[PDB]
Amino acid sequence: TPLQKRLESVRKQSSFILTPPRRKIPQCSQLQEDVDPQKVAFLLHKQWTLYSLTPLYKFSYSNLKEYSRLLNAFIVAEKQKNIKVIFSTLLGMKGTQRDPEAFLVQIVSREGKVLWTGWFCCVFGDSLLETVSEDFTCLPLFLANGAESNTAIIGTWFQKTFDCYFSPLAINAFNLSWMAAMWTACKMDHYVATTEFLWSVPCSPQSLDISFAIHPEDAKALWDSVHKTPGEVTQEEVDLFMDCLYSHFHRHFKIHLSATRLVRVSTSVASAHTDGKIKILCHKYLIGVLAYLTELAIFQIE
Amino acid sequence: EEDALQMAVGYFEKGPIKASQNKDKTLEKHLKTVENVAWKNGLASEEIDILLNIALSGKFGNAVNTRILKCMIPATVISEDSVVKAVSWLCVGKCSGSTKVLFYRWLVAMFDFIDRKEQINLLYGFFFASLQDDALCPYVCHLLYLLTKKENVKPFRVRKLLDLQAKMGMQPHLQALLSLYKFFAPALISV
Numbered sequence: 001t002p003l004q005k006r007l008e009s010v011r012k013q014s015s016f017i018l019t020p021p022r023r024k025i026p027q028c029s030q031l032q033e034d035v036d037p038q039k040v041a042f043l044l045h046k047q048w049t050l051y052s053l054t055p056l057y058k059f060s061y062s063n064l065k066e067y068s069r070l071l072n073a074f075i076v077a078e079k080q081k082n083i084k085v086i087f088s089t090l091l092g093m094k095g096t097q098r099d100p101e102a103f104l105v106q107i108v109s110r111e112g113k114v115l116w117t118g119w120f121c122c123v124f125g126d127s128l129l130e131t132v133s134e135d136f137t138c139l140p141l142f143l144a145n146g147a148e149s150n151t152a153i154i155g156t157w158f159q160k161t162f163d164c165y166f167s168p169l170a171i172n173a174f175n176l177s178w179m180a181a182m183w184t185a186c187k188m189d190h191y192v193a194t195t196e197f198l199w200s201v202p203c204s205p206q207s208l209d210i211s212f213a214i215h216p217e218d219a220k221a222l223w224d225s226v227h228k229t230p231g232e233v234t235q236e237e238v239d240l241f242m243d244c245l246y247s248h249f250h251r252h253f254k255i256h257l258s259a260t261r262l263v264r265v266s267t268s269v270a271s272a273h274t275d276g277k278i279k280i281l282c283h284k285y286l287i288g289v290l291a292y293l294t295e296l297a298i299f300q301i302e
Numbered sequence: 303e304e305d306a307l308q309m310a311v312g313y314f315e316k317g318p319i320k321a322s323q324n325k326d327k328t329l330e331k332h333l334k335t336v337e338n339v340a341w342k343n344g345l346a347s348e349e350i351d352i353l354l355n356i357a358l359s360g361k362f363g364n365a366v367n368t369r370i371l372k373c374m375i376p377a378t379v380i381s382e383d384s385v386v387k388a389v390s391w392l393c394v395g396k397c398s399g400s401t402k403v404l405f406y407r408w409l410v411a412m413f414d415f416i417d418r419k420e421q422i423n424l425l426y427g428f429f430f431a432s433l434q435d436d437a438l439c440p441y442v443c444h445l446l447y448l449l450t451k452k453e454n455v456k457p458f459r460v461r462k463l464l465d466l467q468a469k470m471g472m473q474p475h476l477q478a479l480l481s482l483y484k485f486f487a488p489a490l491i492s493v
Contacts (some may be wrong), residue, residue, distance in 0.1 A: 069489075077491040 006131040006302070020235035025185045026269065026288030031134055033116035035092035039104075043090075044286060046117065048270070048279040049151070050169035050293060053120055053299040055128070055138030056162040061089055067161075072081040074157050075107065075150070083115075084108040095124030095291055100137045107150055114249045118147025118154055123283055124291035127298050139292065140297035143279070167300055168276045169293075173262035179272050179292055180265035181238040183285075184219045185227065191216035197245065198264035199257055211261065212249060216268045223271070226302060307333050308350045315358035321431075326364060337371040348372045348382040356385060357395035365397060369404045373412050380421045385411075387428055393396070399437045406441040413448040425488075426454035433466060443475030447482055455486040464490065 031040065064087040074083040086106045090249045105163070108200050114213030120139035144151040155166040171179070184195055196213035197280030214222070226240035227233070242258075249257040270289040271280035279293060304449060307329055314326045320414050342350055346372065351372050354360045374382075389397050391406065406429075426449055433442045446454075460483055480492045 073491045081493045199360060279405075 002133050007216055009127070009302055013299070021178075022232040022234045024183055024232050025187070026182055026291075027286050028092075028187065028211075029285055029287035031190055031284065032092045032094075034286070035090070037200040039088070039090065040092075040111070040284075040286075043104075043117075043119065044281040044284065044290075045231055045279055046145050046280070048119065048145050048281070049252060049277045050297075051142035051144065051155070051170070051276070052167040052169045052281055052297045053139055053142040054119075054163075054165045054301055055132050055136035055140075056164045057136055059137040059162055061103065061137070062094035065296055066088065066101070070152065070161065071105070071157050075153060078153050082109060083183060089200075090119075090121070090126040093121045093123055093287065093290065095287065095294075096126060097124060098129060099125060100139055101127075102139065105154060106148055106155075114142070116150045116154070118145035118151070121290055121294065123294050125294040125298060127295070128302065131302075140301055141169075141294050148226075152253075158284055169278070169300060170270060170276055171274055171296060172275065175264040175292075175296055176265050176272055179270075179289070180262070180267060181223070181241045182233050182292070183265075183267035184216070184223045184241070185233055186269055186285065188283060188285075193266060194270075195219040195260060195268065196266035198265070198266070201255075201260040209263070210249075212245060212255065213266070214245075214255065219230070242257050244271050303335055304333060304346060305316045307336075308346060310415075311350070312486070315353060315360065316394055319359060320362075327367075328357070330364065330368065334367070334371065340375050342373050342374055344374060344376050344379045344382070347372065348379060351382055352385050352389075354393075355389045355397045355401065360397065362398055362401050365401050366404050369401060369408060373408065374415055376416045377417050378412055379397050379416070379431055380418055383416070383422050383425070383489075387425060390428060390432060392432070399435070403441055406438050406445055408449060410441060413445070416468050419449075423449050425452065426450070427459075430445050430454070430462070436470070438472070439466075440473070440475050443473075443479050447475075447478050450479075450482045450486070452486050455483055455489075459483075460489045 010013060031037075049254070068085045070084060070126070075085065076083050085106075086104070086108055088104040089104040090104060094100070100122045102119065102121035102123070105116070105120070105219065106114045107114050107116035108134045119142070119145070121141045122139040125140055128140055132138050132214045158164050160167070180195070180197060193216065194213045196211055199210040199212060201208050201210070222244055223241055226237055226244060230235065246256070246258045262274065264271065266280075269283050269285050271282065272278050279289065311326065311330055311333070314329070316485065319326055329423055341347070352367060354372075355365055386405070392402070395437070396402070414418070426446070429442055429445055429449065432438055433446070433476070463476065463480060463483060477492070480490060483490055484492055
């Protein structure tokens with residue numbers, strides 16, 4: 001139960017038993033309780049570089065001032081090798097009531113020039129909560145956006161004080177295509193941005209990239225062509241949406257896009273890269289986009 | 303004869319060098335040939351480090367000429383450190399700062415041979431407040447790097463080390479002492 005449950009989970013995950021996760025179309029997530037409108041709205045249109053964060057040992061959402069000081073005195077000491085660190089519980093970035101409340105880590109520089117704005121969130125991540133003990137407050141997702149240098153310093157501090165480890169979360173093109181499909185399946189209005197899929201062909205000498213940017217309403221009507229079962233999108237439906245893209249690109253330019261790999265799928269819901277600098281959160285679906293992102297972080301942790 | 307010879311050196315100190323019928327460097331040099339064999343018994347090291355360095359004749363050459371070889375044969379004892387902390391008294395006589403440099407180098411070099419290092423550790427602040435003067439900082443930093451225990455890392459000492467780092471340079475000796483103070487209660491952080 002305290003570990004052996006996780007061993008059985010690892011067994012289930014490694015078994016790879018008929019995975020196709022028929023996923024519910026990201027439902028309009030009415031902003032739960034507090035969710036500081038200024039804070040969350042500041043947190044939306046920021047390009048979060050995802051990481052996978054192992055559960056934090058001996059963490060508490062009461063000693064935020066002590067960790068703030070302990071990390072502020074560490075960051076400016078890494079400059080010895082002007083900065084304020086504000087740990088801020090977000091109070092609403094959680095899928096179920098039992099999830100740990102998401103909390104921020106902002107490198108505030110004089111004025112509120114937030115240099116780094118870290119973000120640990122655990123939403124709909126009850127595949128990790130029910131397997132880890134009480135001492136660990138598990139937040140699988142870590143969100144950077146500040147320079148990679150400051151991330152590779154706060155990550156070291158977190159490893160030193162909490163025994164949590166940051167693997168840079170890399171969304172594979174399979175998961176990328178999945179999220180590119182469930183985000184054009186959403187029920188949104190006033191599409192903010194075009195549905196762009198930045199492909200990148202695997203040529204050895206050259207590195208040609210393709211931006212198969214579709215009109216966002218035109219991709220919704222193309223998704224409805226391959227959408228038959230409502231409520232949940234299947235792997236076959238996602239693959240048929242992606243293959244309709246393939247058969248509209250190889251039709252035009254005679255180059256098989258399916259022979260290439262997704263690197264970035266911009267959508268009116270949320271942009272999503274591969275190499276880590278992934279989640280822009282244009283719309284307020286972020287509890288669903290973050291649900292997928294946390295479910296993907298479990299895959300890397302577990 | 304060394305105990306007799308060192309008490310003669312003390313007489314060489316109760317009176318001037320000029321008034322002496324024989325040279326000090328002759329008899330102290332016989333003692334130095336003895337040091338080339340065996341320099342100072344625990345009682346001998348104690349006394350000859352006590353009276354030769356507090357205020358008396360103890361020329362900043364002569365007291366140093368002995369201090370280069372004023373260490374111990376068996377081990378250095380607490381009473382050696384006791385009233386040479388009263389040479390660390392650092393006052394009208396003070397065993398002026400050059401001999402202080404060789405003295406703190408003495409302690410750094412022979413920190414390994416004391417019967418009760420806890421006694422000197424209990425004397426931590428007496429040398430920590432000697433860190434403020436510039437000439438002994440490169441050696442007192444080493445000594446406290448050798449003397450430091452958790453009971454000696456009170457936050458006011460942490461702030462004094464930070465004040466020393468801000469006022470003075472980034473000197474690697476202060477960095478080494480800061481590394482210890484970070485290895486203990488982390489009221490300060492530095493890498």
